[PDB]
Amino acid sequence: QTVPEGYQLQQVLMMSRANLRAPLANNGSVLEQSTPNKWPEWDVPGGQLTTKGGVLEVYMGHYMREWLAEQGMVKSGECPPPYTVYAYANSLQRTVATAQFFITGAFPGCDIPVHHQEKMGTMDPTFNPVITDDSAAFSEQAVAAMEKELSKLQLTDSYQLLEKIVNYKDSPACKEKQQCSLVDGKNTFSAKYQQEPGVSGPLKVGNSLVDAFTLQYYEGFPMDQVAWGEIKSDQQWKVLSKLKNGYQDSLFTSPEVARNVAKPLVSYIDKALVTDRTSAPKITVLVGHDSNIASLLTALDFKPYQLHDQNERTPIGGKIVFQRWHDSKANRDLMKIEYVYQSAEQLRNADALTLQAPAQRVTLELSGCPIDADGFCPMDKFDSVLNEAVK
Ligand SMILES: O=P(O)(O)O[C@@H]1O[C@H](CO)[C@@H](O)[C@H](O)[C@H]1O
């Protein structure tokens, strides 16, 4: 796609998801349980981003810069006035790190800080995808809603395949804990107040391992290191990644769970973009997590989508960039949202990102903001979406 003539970009807001990180330490014991195999090592601890993650984000920031300059939002090689860019990430190493690389990459040698709560290592409610309603009746409505969501999915082939690549029957889950079937395993969904919706069972092991295999791919481990050369071969990946996208769908894609869990980001966006656009900076960078993008996208009732050359519905370094454009001809404003990310090969190979060889881009759409032939939506309808979403 290519923006039409007569349109001038006015404001940008990116919802980013941190780049290449090591598998979550939080899932450390479920990976040991799920197989008799040895797990490759990482030089970074728990779930911190890797040096490659930073390198990949630098490219992402350089591409974003070239695009922003090309669109008149900034100039190339000169750096913008004091408060042009505003970067905010939550207090996790992972998210703050990717913001530093992104910014240093987009505006090298400038003086654009990265904001975050003073308390680091802990979560910032803004980005914390937790249940903020202790209605009790709500935690029950949530669990059920999740369960129903899982029912729409079909991961039987994913599990069977997973069982084999993982040699799960020889794992200390089948031997010792009698859990010997991912496909028949019972799933129990949680939703305790002030915490992330969870899953205990085959769906967790599924998402945990596949996430580890997926990260291993990107980090560039040789093929015999990514799932021990097992997950290799064709698109067993397409079916294995369903456990990973199905996990996300059940915990954050539910309508009533999304609306709650996302409450703070919707509120944020609906303020920097609507109620307080006059005070907001031309450019904003929110670095969050896939949970945030999953619940955010749902809460604002987005139309389904599909990312080309990507197996994850929320790409490791992908960013949802909201764009307010002003149509010179007809004195009106317009919203154009797009998912800007790096394909899997772009991540695995670490390709220099430039306008010559751009990052992947898919234009999204809001149910309440029908998109036109060029992918634009009137700022009127969008406004109503966010102002309605916050209610
Ligand atoms: O987007 P990342 O941080 O890489 O991964 C996500 O992070 C979420 C917390 O923000 C957590 O709840 C999800 O399980 C995890 O997949």
Curated annotation (Swiss-Prot):
Optimum pH is about 4. Substrate binds at R17, R21, R94, E196, H289, D290, S291. It catalyses: alpha-D-glucose 1-phosphate + H2O = D-glucose + phosphate. Transmembrane segments: none annotated. InterPro entries: Acid_Pase_AS (IPR033379), His_Pase_clade-2 (IPR000560), His_PPase_superfam (IPR029033), Histidine_acid_phosphatase (IPR050645). The active site is at A18, D290. GO terms for biological process: glucose catabolic process. CDD domains: HP_HAP_like. One of its GO terms (cellular component) is outer membrane-bounded periplasmic space. Pfam families: His_Phos_2. Its EC number is 3.1.3.10. Independent from inorganic phosphate availability, and apparently submitted to catabolite repression, it is positively controlled by cAMP and the cAMP receptor protein. Keywords: Hydrolase, Periplasm, Signal. It is found in: Periplasm. One of its GO terms (molecular function) is glucose-1-phosphatase activity. Belongs to the histidine acid phosphatase family. Homodimer. Absolutely required for the growth of E.coli in a high-phosphate medium containing G-1-P as the sole carbon source. This is Glucose-1-phosphatase. It comes from Escherichia coli (strain K12). The gene is agp.
